[PDB]
Structure 1
């Protein structure tokens, strides 16, 4: 009991600091200024002049023109002070792609009794019940009655709107003039007709002010029985590999972290081979192995994620006129997992209390004595601090230019505490009783009044120590 409690305790502490450093490094969270604003600019906008037909509450099933020629039209032609400018914070990228899942004839069998009324509506997702003929008016493939299974896309398996591997879809040009013309053609005709169950679209962004990539997916699940459900899944992904003098420190911390994980994995195998095995009913050997297993992950994920992201970002120019550039959806499928896995063990790892009792929090909440003592000091320190302020304001009021207004003497004295004295005109304004002020203020503020605070802290620590020792030795 003289080595371990002094060995893996220290090792775990250093492990804690090491992980918290690159937790800070990872903790960018620029989304609140780069994904919240991006989402508001793309999901908080009025389709009409002023109404409730926004992205929050979809307009209507027959509002194809009212919806596509709206905030969506403000994504291909974002005109501000065909264009990419909404709030001077984001730009365009890739090529737009909208999927119109039309549930055409095949919803239910049509008997000879009452098929003449209705037999083809927007039913649940299926294969032989989806779009099989023109979903309304379409001369050719405007309402394309083809299954896009070979489109290199995986179904989202949506709960509110079931997602399949097939469905009518089309892309837009490098601008919105052609996109608007196609939308108008499909509105005069019928492609997103009443049989359409849900509409899906995916998009990317550049946002050159804060260099990153944005992946956004928009889904409007207009139920056949009425209404429409909005869904917006938007998330960023950046690549900052090596340009700075701080990210190299993060890389070094990651290397140190990998060495620590190697140390803990080369240490755990011996506890099962040499030490008696199949003994995990301790709840402590349980965390030791699961933490290591999770830590092995996100190491072979981060490298793979970085490599894949770099490879994908390399080909970011050939998509100006390319047909489809919405293949990055596979990337986020990993990026969020590493965003989740990293927080599925950083708590778990910090959830280790073998070194000190968990239920002994009675000495971390009875420290209110320290808080009470710290309050009977602020009312014994501000009395002396305000008397000096008054004296300075009365003696040096008219001359110094710093002890001019009472609200300024306070800040001047605080700056004096921070070692920002001037003393060029404090003494000039009054040869005697002026330096006396400064000397006594320094002697009573740094020697006799500062140290009572440290004494209070010292006594709080000693009392906590003594109480804990008495409790644990009773």
Structure 2
């Protein structure tokens, strides 16, 4: 099932699109692309430049095939989020020097009033329910499904005019906090949709943070015989999950009411829970392809394939974790001789001590991480958040770090932090694990040999 989903190379399908849109310079002279936007004018150059060139291709207002093979479905939509003027608190000592203020994005601070030339739907707030959207969770904050949206056209000559009119009558003020672009393509040669979303966030402190998301989907599954084979395998997998559920339930009913101090029963229940969650997600995402039908009734509309891509991603994550744990369960049967038996016994008997030492190891790890966060957090760019500090420390363990950047931030307490971390991690902490492992291994081997 899983490797049928991971079929022949769709990596090149994704790579062509990402290279076409992200890496194309916004214009002939400038070297700026979507991955390196730095201001609002860069975004306006990108919208009128590489975006229209990468969207609409030539051969009466016929369809555009992106690589002569990928068909642009319907029209793309552009949508923004705003905040209200005077939505913060400014000190009374400067209320004559500072006039306007816009807070960071929050659902309680977002603008909901018409602005500018209040004629169309780009200058009027539309609710999340009326837009059929949902929250996105960008890099800075979790944005809403509502906002000020505009539906573009099917040809270059009209989308260019629409964007030019949006740019003249200023559409991106200082209150803007995000901007989305969405579209989808088909590529009938294989049976696979692609859903693209381009997000640009404008933080309250200034700047631009671009992000992107390219997801391939298959919504017309039953076409070839291999698809029927995959459907049969799906049914077989559901039958296996039912059998495992009923077996574990009957074995937890009376016999061994505790049932949890084995680590194989725990693995079984983890696998069962992940599998039933995956089955439920699959059932409640495939049974709802009604957006595809709505699009097929009239193909001059915006295809709303965002929730489908989101749930596809969730299903992929659950399936990957389930495959990992099912493969890990293979250790239950490799006991065919004494060499594997003693190694498994060694691991089982050393887990109880390695957990006790790993508590201390992780306490010291977190102490170092929090010190790095508090000292270098505002300067290095690798310690901006606690999770980034943990990732940076794990990378330092590999030697994938740039000591120059962390030395420049603080000439003292930078070298001390780095040197002490490396020394104590490699000279002390990495060797107590070896001491415990070797002691337990020698003890169990000698005990078995003696007995």
Q: Tell which deviates more after alignment, 289-298 or 320-329.
A: 320-329
Cα distance in structure 2, aligned partners of 1:450 and 1:423:
22
Cα distance in structure 2, aligned partners of 1:114 and 1:378:
53
Tell me the residue number matched to 2:209. Answer: 229
How far is the alpha carbon of 1:458 from its aligned partner?
A: 33
8 Å CA contact 1:148, 1:168 repeated in 2: no
Aligned pair in 2 of structure 1 residues 308, 344: CA closer, same or farther (>3 Å)?
Answer: farther
Cα distance in structure 2, aligned partners of 1:191 and 1:199:
11
* Other structure's SS at 1:109 match: coil
Task: Report 1:41-440 matches (<5 A).
Answer: 41-79=20-58, 84-109=64-89, 114-115=94-95, 117-127=97-107, 129-133=109-113, 142-144=122-124, 150-239=130-219, 241-309=221-289, 312=292, 315-321=295-301, 328=308, 331-332=311-312, 334-337=314-317, 340=320, 342-343=322-323, 345-350=325-330, 352=332, 355=335, 360=340
* Other structure's SS at 1:297 match: helix
Please tell me the root mean square deviation across aligned C-alpha atoms, in Å.
19.3
How far is the alpha carbon of 1:288 from its aligned partner?
A: 2.2
Cα distance in structure 2, aligned partners of 1:437 and 1:232:
36
8 Å CA contact 1:103, 1:125 repeated in 2: yes
Q: What is the total number of aligned residue pairs between the two structures?
A: 450
8 Å CA contact 1:41, 1:87 repeated in 2: no
Aligned pair in 2 of structure 1 residues 52, 116: CA closer, same or farther (>3 Å)?
Answer: farther
Aligned pair in 2 of structure 1 residues 27, 465: CA closer, same or farther (>3 Å)?
Answer: farther
Aligned pair in 2 of structure 1 residues 438, 99: CA closer, same or farther (>3 Å)?
Answer: closer
How far is the alpha carbon of 1:172 from its aligned partner?
A: 1.3
How far is the alpha carbon of 1:412 from its aligned partner?
A: 56
How far is the alpha carbon of 1:69 from its aligned partner?
A: 0.8
Aligned pair in 2 of structure 1 residues 113, 176: CA closer, same or farther (>3 Å)?
Answer: farther
8 Å CA contact 2:295, 2:302 repeated in 1: no
Cα distance in structure 1, aligned partners of 2:175 and 2:413:
92
8 Å CA contact 2:81, 2:178 repeated in 1: yes
Q: Tell which deviates more after alignment, 357-366 or 121-130.
A: 357-366
Cα distance in structure 1, aligned partners of 2:414 and 2:108:
95
How far is the alpha carbon of 1:346 from its aligned partner?
A: 3.8
More helix by share: 2
Cα distance in structure 2, aligned partners of 1:88 and 1:38:
13
* Other structure's SS at 1:351 match: helix
Q: Tell which deviates more after alignment, 138-147 or 384-393.
A: 384-393
How far is the alpha carbon of 1:427 from its aligned partner?
A: 78
Cα distance in structure 1, aligned partners of 2:38 and 2:405:
71
Cα distance in structure 1, aligned partners of 2:103 and 2:376:
85
Cα distance in structure 2, aligned partners of 1:401 and 1:194:
25
Aligned pair in 2 of structure 1 residues 293, 458: CA closer, same or farther (>3 Å)?
Answer: closer
* Other structure's SS at 1:327 match: helix
Aligned pair in 2 of structure 1 residues 200, 292: CA closer, same or farther (>3 Å)?
Answer: same
Q: Deviations over 1:171-204 (max 9, x none)?
A: 2123333322121112111111222122112221
* Other structure's SS at 2:129 match: coil
Aligned pair in 2 of structure 1 residues 29, 362: CA closer, same or farther (>3 Å)?
Answer: farther
How far is the alpha carbon of 1:220 from its aligned partner?
A: 0.6
Structure 2: unaligned runs, 5 residues or longer = none
Structure with max Cα Rg: 1
8 Å CA contact 2:292, 2:303 repeated in 1: no
Cα distance in structure 1, aligned partners of 2:108 and 2:373:
88
Q: Tell which deviates more after alignment, 87-96 or 297-306.
A: 297-306
8 Å CA contact 1:108, 1:119 repeated in 2: no
Cα distance in structure 2, aligned partners of 1:119 and 1:396:
34
8 Å CA contact 1:171, 1:324 repeated in 2: no
* Other structure's SS at 1:424 match: helix
8 Å CA contact 1:202, 1:217 repeated in 2: yes
Cα distance in structure 2, aligned partners of 1:224 and 1:427:
29
Structure 1: unaligned runs, 5 residues or longer = 1-21
How far is the alpha carbon of 1:58 from its aligned partner?
A: 1.1
Q: Deviations over 1:258-294 (max 9, x none)?
A: 3333333332233223413113211122122222232
8 Å CA contact 2:291, 2:303 repeated in 1: no
Q: Deviations over 1:207-230 (max 9, x none)?
A: 223232111111111334332111
Normalised to the residue count of structure 2, the TM-score between the two structures is 0.65
Aligned pair in 2 of structure 1 residues 315, 456: CA closer, same or farther (>3 Å)?
Answer: same
8 Å CA contact 1:96, 1:172 repeated in 2: yes
Larger RCO (CA within 8 A; separation ≥ 6): 1
Cα distance in structure 2, aligned partners of 1:116 and 1:125:
25
Q: Deviations over 1:324-353 (max 9, x none)?
A: 776756654655455555546444544645
How far is the alpha carbon of 1:102 from its aligned partner?
A: 2.4
How far is the alpha carbon of 1:442 from its aligned partner?
A: 62
How far is the alpha carbon of 1:92 from its aligned partner?
A: 0.2
8 Å CA contact 1:59, 1:67 repeated in 2: no
Aligned pair in 2 of structure 1 residues 314, 465: CA closer, same or farther (>3 Å)?
Answer: farther
* Other structure's SS at 1:300 match: helix
8 Å CA contact 2:121, 2:148 repeated in 1: no
Q: Deviations over 1:107-144 (max 9, x none)?
A: 32467764455443553113453334565676776543
8 Å CA contact 1:222, 1:229 repeated in 2: yes
